[PDB]
Amino acid sequence: RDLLSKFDGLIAERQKLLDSGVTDPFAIVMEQVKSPTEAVIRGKDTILLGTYNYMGMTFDPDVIAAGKEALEKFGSGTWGSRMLNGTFHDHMEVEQALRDFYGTTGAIVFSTGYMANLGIISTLAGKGEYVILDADSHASIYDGCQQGNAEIVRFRHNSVEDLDKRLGRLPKEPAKLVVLEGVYSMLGDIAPLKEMVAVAKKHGAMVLVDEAHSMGFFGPNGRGVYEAQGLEGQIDFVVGTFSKSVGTVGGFVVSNHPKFEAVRLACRPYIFTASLPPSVVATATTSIRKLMTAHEKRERLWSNARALHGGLKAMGFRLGTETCDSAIVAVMLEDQEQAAMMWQALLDGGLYVNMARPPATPAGTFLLRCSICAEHTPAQIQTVLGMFQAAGRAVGVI
Amino acid sequence: RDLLSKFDGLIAERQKLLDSGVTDPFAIVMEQVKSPTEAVIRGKDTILLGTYNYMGMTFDPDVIAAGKEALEKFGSGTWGSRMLNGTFHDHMEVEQALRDFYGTTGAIVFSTGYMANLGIISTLAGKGEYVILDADSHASIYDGCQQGNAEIVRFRHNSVEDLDKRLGRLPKEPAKLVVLEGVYSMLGDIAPLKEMVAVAKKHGAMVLVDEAHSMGFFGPNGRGVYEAQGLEGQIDFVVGTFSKSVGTVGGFVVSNHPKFEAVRLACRPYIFTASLPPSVVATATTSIRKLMTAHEKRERLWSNARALHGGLKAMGFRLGTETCDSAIVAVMLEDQEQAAMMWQALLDGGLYVNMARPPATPAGTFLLRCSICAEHTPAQIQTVLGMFQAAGRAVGVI
Ligand SMILES: *Cc1c(COP(=O)(O)O)cnc(C)c1O
Ligand SMILES: *Cc1c(COP(=O)(O)O)cnc(C)c1O
């Protein structure tokens, strides 16, 4: 036995899953990519409906041009750590873009969204303090809790009442961080942030909201679910990513806290990693600025989402949400085999959606998750609906 | 009080440091960048000697071209998580490049070197198992220990004897990971990997070596200190980064372990973050392939390092190493003020080096750290020596 013997179980179960299906959903490799919404997968022209490219920014001509120009002028990489080795002025500029986008006095960029959550949670809450989070929080949030030395306080999924009860029972004096997500990504439903933030404030807790799945298309300024729900000026920290709507890699936290800059001095995942490459920062900055006024993209994204949600519901698919509340539409299937057969039929027919099954989802939940793009056309969404109807009828789902 | 009151001390001490100097070393911002070795900083043409661009790959014309082409063909970003949302074939290709570079059967790329260490350490060693590491290990290694649930076993810095003693006293049955760094980056000295690996094997431990500071210029194939010391085929895992020699962002782990692929199934920092952008993967792949045969760059890097080390030693500077053992040359100063005055004089005179002082360094250690580039010319290194002599004499160091 050695350090990898602990994975013998995972190896056996993976092999079992792969034997029982055709295409390995964990090893999808695109061959050629035309657009935000079309690629060649397994030799077939395929509509992409399983990516997080919500605002279709990744082929925006200004975004691409900024990236190319940055490569030319500043090269492929960086000096090292921003704090230790210095940085290009582009990093100051992307932080300014985030200040402008969110209307905050503070913005700190990280190498990934994962690291932004890891770093901010583990740095803000120390020994004897509390992080309070939804039981079904994103892995990066749990990992931030694990990295830190605070107490962790789970509350029942989507329960304002349980948040209130659990907070109320904690010792009064120690500082507290309530961490919420605007969009629950599994089913594409939305958190009751207005009510939960009121509860947090009643108990004197600070609030961090992850707005990774809402950027550019929730709220008057596209800031997120918190903005849509009227919470401007009440959220202590907002965490996000560049990897969904913005169209690159990176993470960030924004805040109006007057001591927010001190996070740079203490945050190990910020200090001990190289700064992002010029092309990445340039694409992010250009994209973020365009997202401030991308009303047409936002319009199409929501029209497409509502068309898909309403259309699938009308066909008799069981969806994760009664109304179209985000750009994720989740189709719920009866069992493992049905989910795989449906997913495979869709793929074979020219549509790629995300399949989520246990243990990624709770036992008994088997999903096909559709993530809409601002650059899908109405015709493409109609094609998608037809593909779902055909595959659903063939497999026996509807 | 709130969650940021814990930083009041850091805020006060930072302000004290800034008041006692002129330029803030933690906020160096380059204005214009010409080459791997020259930029405009505070309006002055400045030789760069504080970056980790060891092989000067960041303006390599093939590297830049690959990045630009990837932006054009594949866009600014990715589908999401490789495992959950699929990937472009470029990711398979960079992993293949790493297999070819290191001569291994396994390669896993991560979004950063920090995350590669975080992920691999926390995933390989579980509850009841042991991670054994140098007391002065890199922060990412300690952070990997913190993220995991293993026992941690520090040994006295650079002590083969203490590694042996500490390992020998652990329970025999549980699996064990010894984590070593090839180059100690603070002073630029080298670890006795040959002797330490023999000790690890005597006690049945697996070995992970971080070769972030050696890639392309140690060993017959540029694989690292372990290769230079004849340890090919004896190292279980090698971790590295794209952010130094390769010239972008990213991390990786390579291995010949037959179950290495299982790490993807279990490693949360690999699973729960977006894949790297096309431009980044393309620049990395092109660079890694060129690094396999970059003999001229390697030659210049080492010639430059030896010229600088020997030249500073001859002038009467106290260096961190008796012989030139890496591409980091550390100058040791007597006190905080002397270090800052010297660093400032160098900067004002047109040279940027890294200043490392407590608590980044041990109390009593005050360093100017020079990191050599393959693209420095002999004339530039002579200019540097003259700048050190002038500043050293003016400040009173020599
Ligand atoms: C997408 C997401 C992340 C990860 O962001 P990356 O930039 O891909 O690392 C973390 N937390 C939440 C809630 C997310 O939605
Ligand atoms: C540079 C370095 C890292 C961090 O790599 P990034 O790619 O900058 O995150 C981690 N560990 C060691 C030993 C390093 O040298």
Asked whether residue A47 is domain-assigned, the answer is yes
Contact B79 A51 (CB under 8 A): yes
Ligand 1 centre to CA of B340 (Å) is 40
Q: For residue B13, how many other CB atoms are within 10 A of its CB?
A: 12
Ligand 1 centre to CA of A114 (Å) is 5
Q: Does B282 touch chain A (CB under 8 A)?
A: no
Structure tokens at B20: 């006692």
Q: For residue B168, how many other CB atoms are within 10 A of its CB?
A: 11
The pairing of strands A366-371 and A354-356 is: antiparallel
The pairing of strands A29-30 and B87-88 is: parallel
Determine the Cα–Cα distance for residues B120 and B108; give it in Å rounded to an integer.
Answer: 10
Sequence-separated (6 or more) residues with CB below 8 Å from residue A52: A213, A243, A244, A245, A371, B79, B80, B85, B274
A204 and A145: one domain? yes
Structure tokens at A306: 């509502």
Between helix B8-20 and helix B336-349 the angle, nearest 10°, is 60
DSSP string covering B224-236, please?
A: -HHHHTT-TTT-S
**CB-based contact A37:A47 (threshold 8 Å):** yes
Ligand 2 centre to CA of B185 (Å) is 10
Question: Which candidate from B206, B241, B244 shows the least CB-CB separation from A2?
Answer: B206
Ligand 1 centre to CA of B179 (Å) is 29
Sequence-separated (6 or more) residues with CB below 8 Å from residue A171: none
Determine the Cα–Cα distance for residues A258 and B3; give it in Å rounded to an integer.
Answer: 12
Provide the H-helix boundaries in B24-112.
61-74, 82-85, 90-102
At residue A376, the 3 state secondary structure works out as: coil
Determine the Cα–Cα distance for residues B145 and B198; give it in Å rounded to an integer.
Answer: 23
Position of tokens 């020994």? A127
Determine the Cα–Cα distance for residues A49 and B397; give it in Å rounded to an integer.
Answer: 64
Q: Does A259 touch chain B (CB under 8 A)?
A: yes
Residues of B in contact with A274 (CB under 8 A): 52, 112-113, 241, 243-244, 249
DSSP string covering A274-301, please?
A: PPPPHHHHHHHHHHHHHHTT-HHHHHHH
Determine the Cα–Cα distance for residues B323 and B310; give it in Å rounded to an integer.
Answer: 8
Sequence-separated (6 or more) residues with CB below 8 Å from residue A273: A81, A111, A115, B112, B113, B114, B115, B140, B243
Question: Whose Cα sits closest to atom 6 in ligand 2?
Answer: B113
Which contiguous run of DSSP H or E holds residue B130? strand B130-134
List residues bridging with B63 in a β-sheet.
Answer: none
Determine the Cα–Cα distance for residues B334 and B48; give it in Å rounded to an integer.
Answer: 24
Asked whether residue A256 is domain-assigned, the answer is yes
Portion 288-327 of B in contact with A at CB < 8 A = none
Portion 320-339 of B in contact with A at CB < 8 A = none
B136 and B243: one domain? yes
Q: What is the CA radius of gyration of chain B?
A: 22
Which contiguous run of DSSP H or E holds residue A117? helix A113-124
**CB-based contact B239:B253 (threshold 8 Å):** yes
Determine the Cα–Cα distance for residues B159 and B161; give it in Å rounded to an integer.
Answer: 5
Sequence-separated (6 or more) residues with CB below 8 Å from residue B165: B155
Sequence-separated (6 or more) residues with CB below 8 Å from residue B16: none
Domain boundary among the residues A294, A313, A342 is at: A294
Q: What is the CA radius of gyration of chain A?
A: 22
Residues of B in contact with A360 (CB under 8 A): 84
Domain boundary among the residues A266, A294, A322 is at: A294
Structure tokens at B79: 């589908």
**CB-based contact A164:A201 (threshold 8 Å):** no
What residue type is B258 in one-letter code? P
List residues bridging with A110 in a β-sheet.
Answer: A251
List residues bridging with A318 in a β-sheet.
Answer: A332
Determine the Cα–Cα distance for residues A7 and A70; give it in Å rounded to an integer.
Answer: 42
Q: Does B84 touch chain A (CB under 8 A)?
A: yes
B234 and B313: one domain? no
DSSP string covering A50-101, please?
A: SS--TT--TT-HHHHHHHHHHHHHH-SS-SS-HHHH-EETHHHHHHHHHHHH
**CB-based contact A320:A358 (threshold 8 Å):** no
Ligand 2 centre to CA of A196 (Å) is 39
A16 is catalytic: no
Cα atoms found within 13 Å of the Cα of residue A26, Cβ hemisphere only = 15
Determine the Cα–Cα distance for residues A136 and A186; give it in Å rounded to an integer.
Answer: 10
Index of the ligand 1 atom closest to the CA of residue A241? 7
Asked whether residue B103 is domain-assigned, the answer is yes
Q: Which among B223, B287, B218 is positioned nearest to B254, based on CA atoms?
A: B223
Contact A74 B248 (CB under 8 A): no
The pairing of strands A44-48 and A366-371 is: unpaired
Determine the Cα–Cα distance for residues B376 and B36; give it in Å rounded to an integer.
Answer: 8
Q: Is the dihedral of CA A59, A60, A65, A70 positive or negative?
A: negative
Sequence-separated (6 or more) residues with CB below 8 Å from residue A385: A307, A308, A311, A312, A315
Position of tokens 């935000």? A36
Tell me the technique behind this structure: X-ray
The pairing of strands B206-210 and B237-241 is: parallel
End-to-end CA, chain B: 49
At residue A315, the 3 state secondary structure works out as: helix
Contact B273 A113 (CB under 8 A): yes
Contact A76 B84 (CB under 8 A): no
Between helix B113-124 and helix B139-147 the angle, nearest 10°, is 40
Whether A137 is in the pocket of ligand 1, judged by its Cβ within 6 Å, is no
Residues of B in contact with A64 (CB under 8 A): 71-72, 75-76
Determine the Cα–Cα distance for residues A82 and A104; give it in Å rounded to an integer.
Answer: 22
Structure tokens at B236: 């279980």
**CB-based contact B321:B347 (threshold 8 Å):** no
Nearest residue of A to residue B28, measured between CA atoms: A86
Shortest distance between the Cα of A390 and any Cα of chain B, in A, equals 23
Position of tokens 């303090």? A129
B153 and B279: one domain? yes
A143 and A190: one domain? yes
Burial classification of residue A232, based on how many CB atoms lie within 10 Å of its CB (0-12 exposed, 13-18 middle, 19 or more buried): middle
Whether B273 is in the pocket of ligand 1, judged by its Cβ within 6 Å, is yes
Angle formed at CA B302 by CA B296 and CA B303, multiple of 5 degrees:
85
Instruction: Tell whether omega for the bond before B359 is within 30 degrees of 0, i.e. cis.
Output: yes
Which regions of chain A does DSSP assign to beta strands (E)? Answer: 29-30, 32-33, 38-41, 44-48, 87-88, 106-110, 130-134, 151-155, 176-181, 183-184, 189-190, 206-210, 237-241, 251-255, 318-319, 328-333, 351-352, 354-356, 366-371
Asked whether residue A13 is domain-assigned, the answer is no
Domain boundary among the residues B272, B294, B316 is at: B294
Q: Does A50 touch chain B (CB under 8 A)?
A: yes
Asked whether residue A339 is domain-assigned, the answer is yes
Q: What is the CATH number of the domain that holds B337?
A: 3.90.1150.10
Contact A273 B72 (CB under 8 A): no
A127 and A234: one domain? yes
Contact B143 A139 (CB under 8 A): no
B46 and B86: one domain? no
Determine the Cα–Cα distance for residues A339 and A25; give it in Å rounded to an integer.
Answer: 12
Determine the Cα–Cα distance for residues B307 and A348; give it in Å rounded to an integer.
Answer: 62
Determine the Cα–Cα distance for residues A331 and A355; give it in Å rounded to an integer.
Answer: 10
What residue type is B86 in one-letter code? G
Question: Which candidate from B29, B67, B206 shows the least CB-CB separation from A76?
Answer: B67
Determine the Cα–Cα distance for residues B239 and A153; give it in Å rounded to an integer.
Answer: 35
How many Å separate Cα A289 from the centre of its chain?
19
B369 and B308: one domain? yes
Whether A241 is in the pocket of ligand 1, judged by its Cβ within 6 Å, is yes
A342 is in which domain, residue-wise? Answer: 20-55+295-398
At residue A218, the 3 state secondary structure works out as: coil
A213 is catalytic: yes
DSSP 8-class letter at A340:
H
A107 and A206: one domain? yes
Residue in B117, B137, B143, B218 to alter for ligand 2 test, most ligand atoms within 8 A of Cβ: B117
Exposure pattern of A367-377 as b/e (b: 16+ CB <10 Å)?
bbbbbbbbbbe
Which contiguous run of DSSP H or E holds residue A394? helix A378-395
A368 and A378: one domain? yes
A161 torsion bin: left (phi>0), alpha (psi -120 to 50), beta (else)? alpha
Cα atoms found within 13 Å of the Cα of residue A7, Cβ hemisphere only = 20
Asked whether residue B7 is domain-assigned, the answer is no
Provide the H-helix boundaries in chain B.
8-20, 61-74, 82-85, 90-102, 113-124, 139-147, 160-168, 193-202, 225-228, 262-266, 268-271, 278-291, 295-315, 336-349, 378-395
What residue type is B353 in one-letter code? V
At residue A236, the 3 state secondary structure works out as: coil
Determine the Cα–Cα distance for residues A271 and A82; give it in Å rounded to an integer.
Answer: 7
List residues bridging with A351 in a β-sheet.
Answer: A47
Q: For residue A9, how many other CB atoms are within 10 A of its CB?
A: 12
Determine the Cα–Cα distance for residues B69 and B281; give it in Å rounded to an integer.
Answer: 12
Sequence-separated (6 or more) residues with CB below 8 Å from residue A333: A318, A339, A342, A366, A367, A368, A397
Whether B137 is in the pocket of ligand 2, judged by its Cβ within 6 Å, is no
A269 and A149: one domain? yes
Whether A214 is in the pocket of ligand 1, judged by its Cβ within 6 Å, is no
**CB-based contact B101:B292 (threshold 8 Å):** yes
B262 and B306: one domain? no
DSSP string covering A2-35, please?
A: -TTGGGHHHHHHHHHHHHHSSS-GGG-EESEE-S
Determine the Cα–Cα distance for residues A165 and A293; give it in Å rounded to an integer.
Answer: 41
Determine the Cα–Cα distance for residues B312 and B314; give it in Å rounded to an integer.
Answer: 5
**CB-based contact B188:B330 (threshold 8 Å):** yes
**CB-based contact A238:A223 (threshold 8 Å):** yes
End-to-end CA, chain A: 49
List residues bridging with B133 in a β-sheet.
Answer: B154, B179
Index of the ligand 1 atom closest to the CA of residue A249? 7
Ligand 1 centre to CA of A186 (Å) is 13
Whether B133 is in the pocket of ligand 2, judged by its Cβ within 6 Å, is no
Angle formed at CA A126 by CA A120 and CA A128, multiple of 5 degrees:
145
Q: Does B270 touch chain A (CB under 8 A)?
A: no
DSSP string covering B107-123, please?
A: EEEES-HHHHHHHHHHH
Asked whether residue B224 is domain-assigned, the answer is yes
Q: What is the CATH number of the domain that holds B89?
A: 3.40.640.10
**CB-based contact A36:A245 (threshold 8 Å):** no
Q: For residue A163, how many other CB atoms are within 10 A of its CB?
A: 26
Asked whether residue A3 is domain-assigned, the answer is no
**CB-based contact B156:B162 (threshold 8 Å):** yes
Between helix A378-395 and helix A295-315 the angle, nearest 10°, is 20
DSSP string covering B161-210, please?
A: HHHHHHHHTS-SSS-EEEEEESEETTTTEE--HHHHHHHHHHTT-EEEEE
Torsion angle defined by CA atoms of residues A354, A360, A361 and A365, in that order, rounded to the nearest 10 degrees = 70
Nearest residue of B to residue A29, measured between CA atoms: B87
Count structural domains, chain A. 2
Determine the Cα–Cα distance for residues B57 and A362; give it in Å rounded to an integer.
Answer: 46
